[PDB]
Amino acid sequence: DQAGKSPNAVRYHGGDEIILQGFHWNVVREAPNDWYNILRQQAATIAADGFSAIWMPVPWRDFSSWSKSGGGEGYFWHDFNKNGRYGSDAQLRQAASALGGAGVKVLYDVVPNHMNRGYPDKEINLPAGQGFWRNDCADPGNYPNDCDDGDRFIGGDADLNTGHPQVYGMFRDEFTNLRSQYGAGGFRFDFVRGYAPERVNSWMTDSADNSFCVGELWKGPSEYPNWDWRNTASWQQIIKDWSDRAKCPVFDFALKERMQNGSIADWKHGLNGNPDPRWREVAVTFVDNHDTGYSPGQNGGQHHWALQDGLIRQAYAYILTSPGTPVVYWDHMYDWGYGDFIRQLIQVRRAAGVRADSAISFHSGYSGLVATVSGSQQTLVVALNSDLGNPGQVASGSFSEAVNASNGQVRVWRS
Ligand SMILES: [Ca+2]
Ligand SMILES: [Ca+2]
């Protein structure tokens, strides 16, 4: 592996990461208090499968509940105690040391925007009136107020004033803690629309300046005020702006939006397809996650914006062979039968030396998605749901088949 910031000082850690989302939505229910044991036991396999990093569930205990039903997944934690629904504190330390030991850096999902303010028994009790909360200030609607420079989570009553010195400090100390005793190699920031992106850069600078980070900004242009430039900008411009200020890579929701609403040919409009390397290199691509996708168990997970089933192979072949930093959803990899296929694609990625900044060109003269990726080791031609006959039609050089599945609907050639 290779470390290092981008030419723009963005924390993409060498730009050579291949990440595994180490969980799905119903884990706390399907494998009660045993997930950390499972991950430690799977560390060897995960490393062998080709992953360089693993996005772990939120480590802060969550005993919340609601009724569909849910709770305890970590996005409504009541304090930093590690004895939550995924396993014990000791178990977390053992899983993290095993993963880190196998060459898989541990990236922690962190939720700074809010907390289970009403939980009865917690180690973090911030009173009202001191400005620790968003609702300490007048809260007219879902937009920044005097006690919160970001959007709010639902009603906003559990929103923290992450800008308050004490609140900012307690998070900073915990990130240092995670890095110091829980083998964290970086962080995945949750609900980044809820607080200033600059604060994320501050936290990283303070606790893990040279680590890897990714933030999820999930907000369409239509969610911005008509006077805000973002209101008429593209999904790409919006997430790129956040990455600029947070100096952290950002989940490619521009690509996800095209995967959900456009044609496969239109996938080229994701952030990872941008002709400017400073733009695509900060994109963290994915197919589905614990929120957008399905999950084994209860109600099939959240599946708030799930990829059409018949595009799963195409989606993975695309993100694993193109620029940006790819993320593989736990379930596709280990529960639904795409593991072998994904394993092959990861090896194709490493063999060609595709990086977050590798060049990519698109070819519209054929059906489907056709592209040429200039990896550091080899050049790849990718044809998904295309009537392309041979790679020589779009690129010069000696090419050999690297992938050919789904009746040629998924074809990759390498030089
Ligand atoms: Ca790296
Ligand atoms: Ca907020």
Give a written overview of the molecule:
Belongs to the glycosyl hydrolase 13 family. Its main location: secreted. It is a single chain. The chain is globular. The chain has 2 domains: about 1-355, TIM Barrel; about 360-415, Golgi alpha-mannosidase II (Immunoglobulin-like), CATH 2.60.40. With about 425 residues, it is an alpha/beta fold. The protein starts with 18 loop residues before the first strand and ends with a strand. Helix 4 (about 165-180) packs across helix 5, helix 5 runs parallel beside helix 6 and helix 9 (about 310-320) runs parallel beside helix 11 (about 340-350). It has helices at about 25-30, 35-50, 90-100, 165-180, 195-205, 235-245, 255-260, 275-280, 310-320, 330-335, 340-350; strands at about 20, 55, 105-110, 185-190, 210-215, 250, 285, 325-330, 360, 370-375, 380-385, 400-405, 410-415. The strands form 2 sheets. Strands 5-4-3-2-1-8-7-6 form an 8-stranded parallel β-sheet. A 5-stranded antiparallel β-sheet has the order 9-10-11-13-12, with helices on one face. The longest helix has 17 residues, at about 165-180. The protein contains 11 helices and 13 strands. One calcium ion binds near residues 152 and 194. One calcium ion binds near residues 1, 2, 3 and 14.
CATH superfamily of the largest domain: Glycosidases
Question: How big is the Rg?
Answer: 21 Å
**Share of residues in helices:** 25-40%
Specify the CATH class of the largest domain.
Alpha Beta
Shape: globular
Query: Structural class, judged by helices and strands?
Result: alpha/beta
Strand content: 5-15%
Give the termini separation: 23 Å
The major pleated sheet works out as: 8 strands, parallel
Ligands (ions, cofactors included): calcium ion
Strand arrangement across the biggest beta sheet: 5-4-3-2-1-8-7-6
How many discrete structural domains? Answer: 2
Order of helices and strands: EHHEHEHEHEHEHHEHEHHEEEEE
